[PDB]
Write a protein that binds this ligand. Sequence first.
Ligand SMILES: *[C@H](C)[C@H]1/C(=C/c2[nH]c(/C=C3N=C(/C=C4\NC(=O)C(C=C)=C4C)C(C)=C\3CCC(=O)O)c(CCC(=O)O)c2C)NC(=O)[C@@H]1C
Ligand SMILES: *[C@H](C)[C@H]1/C(=C/c2[nH]c(/C=C3N=C(/C=C4\NC(=O)C(C=C)=C4C)C(C)=C\3CCC(=O)O)c(CCC(=O)O)c2C)NC(=O)[C@@H]1C
Lengths: 448, 445
Amino acid sequence: ITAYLSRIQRGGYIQPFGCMIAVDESSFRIIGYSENAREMLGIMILAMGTDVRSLFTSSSSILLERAFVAREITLLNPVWIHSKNTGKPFYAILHRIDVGVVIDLEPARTEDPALSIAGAVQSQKLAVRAISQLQALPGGDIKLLCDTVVESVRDLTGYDRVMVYKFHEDEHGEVVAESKRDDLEPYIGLHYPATDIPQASRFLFKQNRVRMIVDCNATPVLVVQDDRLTQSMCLVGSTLRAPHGCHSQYMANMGSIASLAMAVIINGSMRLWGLVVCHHTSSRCIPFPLRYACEFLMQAFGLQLNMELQLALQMSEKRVLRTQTSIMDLVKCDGAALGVAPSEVQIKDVVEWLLGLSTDSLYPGAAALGDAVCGMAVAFLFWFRSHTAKEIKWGGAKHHPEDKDDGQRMHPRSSFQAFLEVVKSRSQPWETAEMDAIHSLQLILRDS
Amino acid sequence: SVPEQQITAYLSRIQRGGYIQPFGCMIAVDESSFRIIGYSENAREMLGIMPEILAMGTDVRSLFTSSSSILLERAFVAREITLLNPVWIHSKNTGKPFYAILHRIDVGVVIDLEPARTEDPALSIAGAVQSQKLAVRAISQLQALPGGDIKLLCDTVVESVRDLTGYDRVMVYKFHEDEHGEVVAESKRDDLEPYIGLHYPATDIPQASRFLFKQNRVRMIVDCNATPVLVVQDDRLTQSMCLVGSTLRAPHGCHSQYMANMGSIASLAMAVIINSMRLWGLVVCHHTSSRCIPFPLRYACEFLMQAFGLQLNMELQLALQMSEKRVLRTQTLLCDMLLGAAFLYPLXXXXXXXXXXXXXGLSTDSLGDXXXXXXDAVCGMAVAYFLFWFRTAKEIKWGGAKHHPEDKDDGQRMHPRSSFQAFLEVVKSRSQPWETAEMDAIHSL
Ligand SMILES: *[C@H](C)[C@H]1/C(=C/c2[nH]c(/C=C3N=C(/C=C4\NC(=O)C(C=C)=C4C)C(C)=C\3CCC(=O)O)c(CCC(=O)O)c2C)NC(=O)[C@@H]1C
Ligand SMILES: *[C@H](C)[C@H]1/C(=C/c2[nH]c(/C=C3N=C(/C=C4\NC(=O)C(C=C)=C4C)C(C)=C\3CCC(=O)O)c(CCC(=O)O)c2C)NC(=O)[C@@H]1C
């Protein structure tokens, strides 16, 4: 039913910057492994049914033995594991799927433990501090929140470009705030079609809230599984999951070799309001502690943003109902029949034509008298409403409302160059609550 | 909340008690030079320094490994030490692992040493992320929470802390307007009896404690009956050291005996803060047996309590907005439709004469406190001048003693109550409280 779903969830390819080993929870037998595992572990004795504890040191062995039995595996991540052959350190990110226990081995850049530990502690500390700074911001100012959070996230991660990508009502997105590198060109203010980010990706982002991609140009690695498995494994929770081909070529064409997307969650029962994407001109990999730290920071961001939204909304409605009982500051309309509205001529003509009504695009005759008068509300009072922003700067493509997603499509667009668009002469779409208030007010005026 | 300078009760002894809990060592060390200016009595015992190595005026860095030593050195010169807690430390000879919770005081720096479980170095990395991990999970339990409800928040949070730590009882204690508290939600052990619904006097928690919980948001007591440990400090020190932030700070005797009497041999209090900040209440934990939880869990719980604080603040503001929206929309509604409560049309004469004699907008809780109307159906009322509103008896359960408005904290008092037997008090001659929103709405009519 959902496009790209099974292809992202159970796509038998992982990123080549690390290796992955899928184990049977009850028998500790290997039921899956990526082809780069043998090379990365320096095995040059790894097959289907090989005891995992034989691949690593005995301490690591009994440690992961403790890990499998545990009520919650996530609490032991990451497991610092040494290899039998090489002796090089690996971060072990364990999680559970419907088949067994998946182990994500990510090579550790620092070899001496003290420096790595100090780095992790430093990262967590920087996350706590970033959140603390994020808490002291004045309320109501969401733009300041997003700017300070892209500056913070950029300061922590070190990516050349960091930005907040807001999902609008019609599922089309918009970079609302960014902290790019100075010499890089601004992607801020741009708009993108809804098909750039499929519903499947947004759903999986609601479930999995942090996704790292080290290199789009890097050749994906096929993970071979035991022939006894009914279907291809669920590599959603895997931090090494290779991106879909279309998004790989997408990142390739956009100039983002290394990506990192985090979810922005509110509620309406959770809802994905937007993302915070990070693009790097070159390829880079950040360790697990930094990633989890960023997930925490993004959790705080999601909470605070949710608060701001709720409070601003209820306060807005409260302000409407309070101003109801200054006439001009009642609704968002520019004209009220006084205000952004012509003389009694166009009024006479419109009234002449009128003999519950509301439109967002104004009746060709008197609609060319002014660019302001485009929205009409009739119920005896008349409401004029100004037209929307007549220019939208898209990033290579326009969001077509009747355009949907299909799993067979596996090739993106060629360029994301900013191009302007003149939307049809329309006013801002009249809300339903506004019309209900118009009815209530109509009854009120009918009484007296 | 209350002003800082007005609080005088228990403060001097709570801050500088000179007594710590016996589950961890405590060493106060000068900042410039790492010489010891203070140390607990049992400090030599847990570190295996018992026969000198540890004494007044000895380099504390020589009491641990060089790695732990330079960790401390970089901790002292940090921007803010509180962000480096806990500092992992190994002993010099016994090699015993310790969580070091550091606090910068007026003169020197207090170092709390908590005995940690010997874990494999391979988990060290996994150990570094633990606090934020537990915190992320617990808060994630709050993210998937339908906004609007205030009870489900406290319930799910209480349950979250219940599963996080492992206490036999976890609950939310809320401070009312007259400083007296009430248990709003709890996750008792199925065996135990519920403390839910019953209130407490304001003198149960002194102003000093509530004030102190602002700067120190987490407090753990592994055992009240455990014999406190005297801290030995230098002779040159003018006064007792400021153990206001120590995680080992022994409870003031009255609260220890309080815990003993209530049955809570193990306590864990976490303050919740909303919006110059305000203490809304605490989240307290009780255990039938002794319970010492590691510092990372207390940190995670602190995060969870910040999240809970902000979220609850949001819920409060939303609730206010909704209520105001309701009374306002009803106001406009009736105002439009026009163009028990008495309108001078009940929905008699003696009450009118009494009102004419008393008026020689008002809000009265007790008419006896016009005495004629007292001769209970018309408990209290609100007068608008000529419209009148007549409201009223709600029962309140107390857990041992009633809170009187004459109750004041006594700094010299050192003995708590004996019984917390839940008794029920009904209230007459005190009608339904005329809220600010209600009275302002009436005045706006
Ligand atoms: C294929 C023909 C179609 C397609 C498929 C597709 N896209 C994704 C995931 C993402 N797409 C994103 C789009 C942007 N990237 C940006 O930098 C910006 C703006 C500055 C946009 C709008 C983003 C973001 C994602 C998620 C990032 C991540 O790391 O996951 C996927 C899912 C792949 C996966 O494996 O998760 C797929 C299948 N996108 C297209 O544009 C065409 C139409
Ligand atoms: C002594 C004569 C008076 C007294 C002193 C006192 N109380 C505290 C601290 C707390 N008291 C609390 C009350 C409760 N605990 C509960 O579990 C419940 C209900 C279920 C209540 C109402 C709480 C909570 C605290 C804070 C906990 C903590 O660990 O600090 C103190 C300060 C203690 C310290 O840290 O030194 C003192 C001096 N309490 C009394 O009731 C009598 C009147």
